Amino acid sequence: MENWSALELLPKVGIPTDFLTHVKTSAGEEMFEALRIYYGDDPERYNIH
Amino acid sequence: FEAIFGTFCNRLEWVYFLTSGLAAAAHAIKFHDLNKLTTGKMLFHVQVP
Amino acid sequence: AMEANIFCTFDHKLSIADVGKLTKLVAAVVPIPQRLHLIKHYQLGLHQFVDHTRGYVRLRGLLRNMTLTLMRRVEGNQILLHVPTHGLLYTVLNTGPVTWEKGDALCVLPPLFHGPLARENLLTLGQWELVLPWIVPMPLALEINQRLLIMGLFSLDRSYEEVKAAVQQLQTITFRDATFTIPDPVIDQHLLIDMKTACLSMSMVANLASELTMTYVRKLALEDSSMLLVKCQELLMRLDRERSVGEPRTPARPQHVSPDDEIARLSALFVMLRQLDDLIREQVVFTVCDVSPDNKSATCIFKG
Amino acid sequence: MAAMEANIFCTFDHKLSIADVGKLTKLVAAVVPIPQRLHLIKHYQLGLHQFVDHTRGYVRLRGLLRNMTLTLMRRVEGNQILLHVPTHGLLYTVLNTGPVTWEKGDALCVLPPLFHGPLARENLLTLGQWELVLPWIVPMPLALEINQRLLIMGLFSLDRSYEEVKAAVQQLQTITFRDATFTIPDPVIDQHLLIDMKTACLSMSMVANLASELTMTYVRKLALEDSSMLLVKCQELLMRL
Amino acid sequence: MDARAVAKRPRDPADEDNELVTALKAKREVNTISVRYLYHADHQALTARFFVPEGLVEFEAQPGALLIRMETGCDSPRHLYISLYLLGIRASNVSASTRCLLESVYTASAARAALQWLDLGPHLLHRRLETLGCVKTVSLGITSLLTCVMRGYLYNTLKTEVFALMIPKDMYLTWEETRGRLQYVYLIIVYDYDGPETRPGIYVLTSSIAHWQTLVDVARGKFARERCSFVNRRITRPRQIPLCTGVIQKLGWCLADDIHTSFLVHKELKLSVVRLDNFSVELGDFREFV
Amino acid sequence: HPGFALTAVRTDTFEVDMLLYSGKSCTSVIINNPIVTKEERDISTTYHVTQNINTVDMGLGYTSNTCVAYVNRVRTDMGVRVQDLFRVFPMNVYRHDEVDRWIRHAAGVERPQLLDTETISMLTFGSMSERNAAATVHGQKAACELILTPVTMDVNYFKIPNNPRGRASCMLAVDPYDTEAATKAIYDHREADAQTFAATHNPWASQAGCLSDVLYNTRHRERLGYNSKFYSPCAQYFNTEEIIAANKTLFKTIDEYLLRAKDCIRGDTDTQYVCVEGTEQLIENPCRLTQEALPILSTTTLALMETKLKGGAGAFATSETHFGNYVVGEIIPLQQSMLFNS
Amino acid sequence: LDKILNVEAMHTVLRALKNTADAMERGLIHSFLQTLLRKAPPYFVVQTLVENATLARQALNRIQRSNILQSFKAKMLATLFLLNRTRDRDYVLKFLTRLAEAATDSILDNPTTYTTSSGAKISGVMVSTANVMQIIMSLLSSHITKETVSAPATYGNFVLSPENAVTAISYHSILADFNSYKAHLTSGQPHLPNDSLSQAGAHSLTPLSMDVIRLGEKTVIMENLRRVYKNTDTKDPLERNVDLTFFFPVGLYLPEDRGYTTVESKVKLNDTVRNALPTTAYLLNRDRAVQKID
Amino acid sequence: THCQENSETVALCTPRIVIGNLPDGLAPGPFHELRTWEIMEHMRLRPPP
């Protein structure tokens, strides 16, 4: 798969986003290639092997 | 006598990519090691209010 | 100066683990339908010619005309593919099942993987795979080429236990190396269209000639310059045992045949050799001089 | 000896009109054979013309043309022609002299020309009672059926009344390949066809005594069980049962 | 892509220093090896090294002699590299005097193995062979490592001398009375059928003919006897399927002025052989024919 | 009148302009230096000048869109000329000889027993059999054919844009990635149909394995010998093995619609043929996305047709009936507009 | 006589090089248009999404898919050809501004590039054949205003940092501006100033005249491309073809029991069984002319 | 149909021969009478004897 959580630690730019009809749908109808959505607070961001 | 008046040539017109207005969509960037790179990926991390 | 090549690109993205699979085939033949310069991966390889109903002979007949090409150097985002020149030595990877000794005359054949699985799968990519033609010594091609033609002639006779067993014997060649059974062309009780047309090309030549050649041999044998056509008139009889005390003294010849149809039968005899010609004469495409240890690479002078 | 030359210079002797040297400038990169293969050839030995004979036989040409050294013309000019002997396996352009159109990927063959019939090319390059005939380059299938027609003419010729042979040859010579028609120039039964008659009847009769009991029987087995369009006409050529 | 860049003449490798010199000029290190000039750098000939056991070296020390592989059954001696001369003992064309002459020369178990493996098989001779080219630079040891040309001219290293093809005189034949300026050499095995075994007769047939059809047409002329004997065996024996009666393979070419007699000299045994001198090798393949 | 009815489908190709729109900096195009490889034919040296480009997209949603702006002219004949199946399936023949001789002479198709290698090849495969005709005054032509029940309702089925197959197959309704449920909705007749909730408006096409399925599903057609050069307008409705595989989440679907949904059609020859795949412009086909087909103007009799040509601007759209005879009004006023507007 | 050929060869080389460079530029234009034509959904798709954006807060329910499909089908038949049916200026203007309002904003937008003189800021470009823009200049002459756009003048470059050579070799991966991440991770700061693709290119800008349109505070560029396709052998990618499958019954049988007859005051068919059962059907050609299928 | 053999449910395809076999669902009763008036019209029997 694609390694996430590098993404939650590597400083990202920050940019005004724009998707018609919000984000959850266009992440749910497979507009984007790879995606992952977590609900609580996945402590994987904290594990660094 | 049978007269050949002037011989004539088509004069070509050059067009350039950046001169075109369609380049308003592109954001062209040279990258001399482009044949090496397999794929380029951009990752987005948007939290939902 | 740079060597002449043919660049190839993959419409579908490539994985880091995928591009490593190409470095394995960097020295392997990759047939191309047509000489061009830029080529999408779709037109690359033999997979475009896969069919469901069409069989081995379709692949062979189109494979004769495709432009052979080695892979040269993976670029990550591109692939070079050198077109071999006649009379210069090129190394080739041993995709064929059989090990090559030095001096062998190799030739290209469609892949002939049989039922139980062995190492086959490499480069699944977007519902697409890079099938590669077998490279095989000339005699093994001459033998495989006939095994299929005989299983085709038996495709009509699967009720019999004797043919049922003989087909199995033709199915498993026994070569000077590990053995490789040949897939049966017959399937679903019914023969594929290519082998059927080829078997017709053979049986027409086998039958149309027998009734036709007597009208000509009877006339040629008169001259006697060659001195064997009289002996050939007896060869026409197709008797196996010595003749009984009965009918045969001369071969059977057609009677009265209407003046024009004899031209049409004659020309239809020649139309069937053209259908058969793709299988009649295999052609060498490489002649290996030295072989690498483990018979894995070879360095063949190119032919064709 | 001096090895066979790659570049060969051809010199005309007859006075060349300013009009005619222009035909050869348009004739560049054509397929022109020579028998001799020396470095400084005469114009007399150019092309197929030297082998025209009173016999007026087409197969004599097909046979003598096989032995000639094919050359590709190059760098034509006043006073000089520069034929090139091609090397095996190396690429070359080839000018399309004949009307036949060339599909991509088709193989080519060299056979003596087959005049259209009613019309002939004007720019013959005839000079001094020496015409410049050159062999046609045709796709392989047309070169196959021209020879198949010639051989059928040779086989049918024997054992048939001479009036019947006229009716057959009247049609065996015309060929409609690729929607163009063509006609064999004076095809004639000869000794040159006779030896081929002998070899064809011999190989085709030794074929009859090599097919297995099942190999001949396969068609009977097929038609009695399955039928299709291919099989209808094969049921016809099988005369009776 | 500049206008001048296409205008440049093609650059020959001798004009540029050797690639090893191009590295040593950059890095200035000086090995004991003389990389100032590379040997064998101008060789259109393609070659291959073949280990051949010492029982087969005789009459091959002279550069120029066919190498023909011979597949035989047994998996341990997978092949064996026969000369053209060693194959002459089996041929029926060869003179009995020449045959008994040279048969003494092959008094080795390695060579006698060749006669045994020739006798062993029911299948025809032309199947088991695959010509490899011509000898040069005999390694000449307890086990010679013969260098064999696959294509191009035979010649010395440094091109100081041109090795010549040697063909034993009894195998050499010419069809024509007026030799052409150039003529091709073809090797021709021709089975003449006979009761206990179909004995082969080898020949080497130089001819200006190149076209296959005209070549086989002229060949059936002299070989009408063998062809008619094949047809006669075809009807004499039922359920016997004997195949092709001669087989021709293009062996290369020579200028037809070079041809002249000579003799090989070995163990004080003169052997008359025709000598094509500047024989370029260009291998073909066996072409079955009736 | 024999017992059955026909429901010909017929694609028509329109030359047209597009207008694209795209945002600023909608996709970056990284490029490297062009490199010039060289080749030689010894009569002339071609040089080839490659260049590499990769286009990262720089928009989360769709940054660009398109509309069909202007129809200039029609390429297709819009004639009837139903497709000759005798050339689409050249191999098949009646077992009896005399009956097939008689049928060929009645239907107008015949083959001459020359065994021309062109005839052998054609019966074997392809060969582009038709060889265009003397003077084409209209253009490309085709029609298709579905044997059907006369009882077929039309007021619920033929007046409105709908599926020729007889059973609606819009994978957009079906749950994504649901093959067990997508195979019921397109095939099963116990589960109630989409648009009209009757199980099957035509049984002889909507069943799995019906005559029209085995006749036009290319997966079925392959097992019989058939000419692949000829383009069949109906097959897109019956290639069920592919459309079952097309149902995917909405955006994968509208990405698929831009890439494969096109159907190349050869443009110079008289009749439609499958082009050398992707060599030409691919022809977009919106009806493929919905798996429906648009009614065109049809009348049983001339009297109802005269009233249309005599009538007002809106005349062609209104459908009418007369005790047995009907007029199926067009959904799109192209017969009013592309023609009269000129 | 020889110097003439010596000069003619040089001129042929220069011609074969200038024309190939120009073909390269036109091929780059062509490929960038081919890319958009593959990433550009049709109008009705974007419009349905732009109308049903609110309701679908989650992966859409079984019912919402049906609403969306219905809207696709409706928009398709009422938007298929626009300049062909309608030319109402107030409606064509509404449709074109609807096309711009339906397109989503790009990730990165550099204020400096493509700025019209006098403070205007461009948003996108729309392209079409000549005969279309000639209709638009007539219908919207009020809004189109030729202006001097400040386009970027040179390609950018994306040079690799020294640290990237190691990560490319050991790990087969390259993150842009590795050295900036090392600083922001050590210093603990979360945001990045720029994400490197806006970092590269377009430092030098040059003017060029363009036509722009006001689409409700949007300024879209209008650009014809037929200029680059004159006398070329490649078909314009914007000219396309659209297939439409049609289907018609022939030879049906309407019920006798529940039979009925609207118009009958208009026609009067002769009493005959041939008038009773339909056996044929009638259509019309490309040019209007009666056509028959028996 | 699906006939029931010796504890099997073997399927049985069988030619329809006459046009009347089509089910009265697909070729209703009045349809055949209307079609027969077509045939008696074709024979010039529109008023039958």
Residue numbers in the entry:
A (entry chain A): 1 to 49
B (entry chain C): 50 to 98
C (entry chain r): 3 to 306
D (entry chain q): 1 to 241
E (entry chain p): 1 to 290
F (entry chain C): 1029 to 1370
G (entry chain C): 148 to 441
H (entry chain C): 540 to 588
What does the paper say about this structure?
Here, we report sub-particle cryoEM reconstructions of HCMV virions at 2.9 Å resolution revealing structures resembling non-coding transfer RNAs (tRNAs) associated with the virion’s capsid-bound tegument protein, pp150. Through deep sequencing, we show that these RNA sequences match human tRNAs, and we built atomic models using the most abundant tRNA species. Based on our models, tRNA recruitment is mediated by the electrostatic interactions between tRNA phosphate groups and the helix-loop-helix motif of HCMV pp150. The DNA confining hexon channel is “secured” from the outside by β-herpesvirus-specific tegument protein pp150, whose N-terminal one-third (pp150nt) is resolved.
One icosahedral asymmetric unit of the capsid consists of six types of heterotrimeric triplexes—Ta, Tb, Tc, Td, Te, and Tf—located at geographically different local 3-fold positions. Tf and its corresponding pp150s are smeared out by the local 3-fold averaging due to the icosahedral symmetry imposed during previous reconstructions. Using sub-particle classification, we released the 3-fold symmetry and obtained a reconstruction of the asymmetry structure of Tf at 3.6 Å resolution. Like other triplexes, Tf contains one copy of Tri1 protein and two conformers of Tri2 proteins. After this symmetry relaxation, a tRNA-like density along with the underlying three asymmetric pp150s emerged. However, this density is weaker than the tRNA density on Ta. A slight change in position of pp150nt-c on Ta and Tf, which alters only the flexible interactions between the CCA tail and pp150, dramatically reduces tRNA binding or increases the flexibility of tRNA.
